Scaffold this active site. Structure first.
Site, PDB file in Angstrom:
ATOM      1  CB  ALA A  36      37.485  -0.924 -15.294  1.00  0.00           C
ATOM      2  CG  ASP A  37      39.542  -6.186 -12.960  1.00  0.00           C
ATOM      3  OD1 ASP A  37      38.511  -6.243 -13.661  1.00  0.00           O
ATOM      4  OD2 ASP A  37      39.591  -6.587 -11.779  1.00  0.00           O
TER       5      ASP A  37
END
Length: 82
Positions: A36-37
């Site tokens: 998850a950026d």
């Protein structure tokens, strides 16, 4: 936070990072490690805020790294009620 809350959040998060059946999320798992950026994390809190009808600023959810971290901020808000 409680074990029940962690399940709720993880369910939403894992759903954003995958279908949920081909992914494994836990309280020890890190949003960054799960894949998850910065663009994903922001979406996590958004989907959660609408789920628990809560609201939190991103700058406040900075320390947030793992599921538990995000669970504490949420569970901590619901308590403010009543």
């Amino acid at each position: 936070a409680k074990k029940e809350t962690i399940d709720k959040v993880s369910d939403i998060v894992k759903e954003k990072l995958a279908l949920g059946a081909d992914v494994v999320v836990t309280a020890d798992s890190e949003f960054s490690k799960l894949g998850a950026d910065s663009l994903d994390t922001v979406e996590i809190v958004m989907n959660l805020e609408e789920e628990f009808g809560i609201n939190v600023d991103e700058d406040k959810a900075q320390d947030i790294s793992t599921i538990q971290q995000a669970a504490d901020v949420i569970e901590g808000l619901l308590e403010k009620k009543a």
